[PDB]
Automatic annotation (TrEMBL), chain B:
Location of this fragment in the whole protein: 1964 to 2071 of 2178
Record's protein name: LPXTG-motif cell wall anchor domain protein
Length: 219, 108, 77
C-alpha cells in the first residue's frame, strides 16, 4: 500500500566517498507501533539485504554514522558517509505494517578497484567424464577487477555457443577482484570430431586474450 | 676464416661424421660422444650451463687433463656453486634463490 | 511460537527465496534466514565428482588443484 521507491539503481563508488539516497512515501507512514513505515536495507554477499534504519524517523541502535536515518515524514534521506569494500550491495526501502510490502527499486553498489590481469590455469578434461559421453574443459581466471568480460569457447578455433558458458564469482573479501571460470560442454560424438580444444576470454585487464589448448587424448 | 688448423678451435667447428644432426641436441637426451669424430670446438657458455655434447666432451677432456677428484667432478657437481654464489651470480629457480656456477668460473 | 505458510498448485515460477520475517515489533527485528524452495519435478541428482588434476606445468611457487562437480540438480547448499 505505502509504496516505497528509489531513483538510483546501480553505481560504482570508491571507498571514503559520500553517497546519498532518498526514498519517498505514497501513503500514510503509520505502522503497527505508529512509527514511519520505511526500513532501510543493504545487500550483503552470501545472504539477503540486512536492515539499516527502521521506524523511519528513528536511527537504529548500533548503526554507524555512515548510514543516516534522519529521514522523517513522507520523504526520507539516507547517506553513506564513507564506503567500505564490504558495503557493496543493493539498498532497499520498504514498508512493514500493512499487507502489500512495497520495496524500493534498489540501488546496487559496486566497489571501484584498479584493473588487474587475471591468471590462467587450464585443466584438461578427466577421462572419467569422457566415459560418461560428455566433456568439460576448465579455463580458470582469477582475481581480476573488471567483471565485464566475454568468453569464447573456440573448439578447433571455432567458437561454439548455447552449451558452454561462463561462471564469475563476486567481489572478493580480500581485494574485491572477480574470478572467472568457463566450462566447455561437448558430447562424446562431438568430442571425437574435434582434436584441439581452446579457451578464449576477452577481458579489459588482458592486453590480449590468453588461450591454452589441449590435443584430444592428452589424458 | 678457417685457413689453418689453429683457426678451427677459434671458430668452434664440429665434424659432420658422427654428429650429422643439423637441429638441436636437446637437454636431457641420450647423447653419446663419438671417439673418432673430432670436436675442435672449445666452446663454453658465458652463462652457467654448458649443454650436453660440449658438456660431456669438456668433462672427458678435463678428466684427461686432471684427475677425477679435481676436474670432471668440479666441472659438473655444483661444487663451486657455494663459492659462485658468494662471488655473486645469484639466481632464483622453482621459487627459491640458489647460486649459479659458470664455465669461466670452473675454468678459473 | 510458529507461523504457517501454505503453498498449493506449485509451478516453476513459484521457485523463489522465501522469507518469513518479523515486523510490527521493536522488541524483535532479527533478520531471518528464509528458505530455499525449488519447484521442479526432477528428482535430486548426486553430483558427478571429477578430480581434475593440473596435468600441464604447475605455477612456479604454487601447485594448483581443482575439484569439478557436474550433473547435480538441486542448487541448495
Amino acid at each position: 500500500d505505502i509504496v516505497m521507491t528509489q531513483s538510483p539503481l546501480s553505481l560504482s563508488v570508491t571507498p571514503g566517498e559520500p553517497a546519498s539516497i532518498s526514498c519517498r512515501s505514497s501513503q500514510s507512514l503509520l505502522r503497527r507501533d505508529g512509527h514511519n513505515d520505511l526500513e532501510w536495507y543493504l545487500q550483503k554477499p552470501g545472504q539477503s539485504p540486512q536492515p539499516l534504519i527502521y521506524l523511519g524517523s528513528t536511527r537504529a541502535s548500533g548503526v554507524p554514522d555512515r548510514f543516516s536515518g534522519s529521514g522523517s515524514g513522507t520523504d526520507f534521506t539516507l547517506k553513506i558517509i564513507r564506503v567500505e569494500a564490504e558495503d557493496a550491495g543493493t539498498y532497499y526501502c520498504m514498508q512493514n505494517k500493512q499487507t502489500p510490502l512495497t520495496f524500493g527499486q534498489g540501488t546496487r553498489l559496486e566497489i571501484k578497484r584498479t584493473v588487474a590481469a587475471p591468471s590462467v590455469f587450464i585443466f584438461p578434461p578427466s577421462d572419467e567424464q569422457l566415459k560418461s559421453g560428455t566433456a568439460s574443459v576448465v579455463c580458470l581466471l582469477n582475481n581480476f577487477y573488471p567483471r565485464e568480460a566475454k568468453v569464447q569457447w573456440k573448439v578447433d578455433n571455432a567458437l561454439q555457443s548455447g552449451n558452454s558458458q561462463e561462471s564469475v564469482t563476486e567481489q572478493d573479501s580480500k581485494d574485491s577482484t572477480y574470478s572467472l571460470s568457463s566450462t566447455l560442454t561437448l558430447s562424446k560424438a562431438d568430442y571425437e570430431k574435434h582434436k584441439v580444444y581452446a579457451c578464449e576470454v576477452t577481458h579489459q585487464g588482458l592486453s590480449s586474450p590468453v588461450t591454452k589448448s589441449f590435443n584430444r587424448g592428452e589424458c | 676464416n678457417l685457413t689453418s688448423f689453429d683457426k678451427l678451435i677459434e671458430n668452434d667447428v664440429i665434424t659432420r661424421r658422427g654428429y650429422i644432426d643439423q637441429g638441436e641436441y636437446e637437454r636431457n637426451g641420450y647423447h653419446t660422444i663419438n671417439l673418432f669424430s673430432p670436436i675442435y670446438s672449445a666452446l663454453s657458455s658465458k652463462i652457467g650451463t654448458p649443454g650436453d655434447l660440449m658438456g660431456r666432451r669438456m668433462a672427458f677432456e678435463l678428466l684427461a687433463a686432471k684427475g677425477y677428484k679435481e676436474g670432471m667432478v668440479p666441472y659438473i657437481s655444483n661444487q663451486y656453486e657455494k663459492e659462485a654464489k658468494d662471488r655473486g651470480s645469484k639466481i632464483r629457480s622453482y621459487g627459491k634463490e640458489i647460486g649459479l656456477v659458470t664455465d669461466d668460473l670452473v675454468l678459473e | 511460537n510458529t507461523a504457517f505458510l501454505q503453498m498449493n498448485s506449485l509451478k516453476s515460477d513459484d521457485t523463489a527465496m522465501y522469507y518469513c520475517v518479523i515486523r510490527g515489533d521493536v522488541y524483535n527485528r532479527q533478520w531471518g534466514q528464509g528458505t530455499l524452495v525449488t519447484v521442479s519435478s526432477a528428482s535430486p541428482t548426486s553430483p558427478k565428482v571429477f578430480p581434475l588434476s593440473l596435468c600441464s606445468t604447475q605455477p612456479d611457487g604454487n601447485v594448483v588443484i581443482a575439484c569439478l562437480v557436474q550433473g547435480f540438480f538441486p542448487q541448495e547448499p
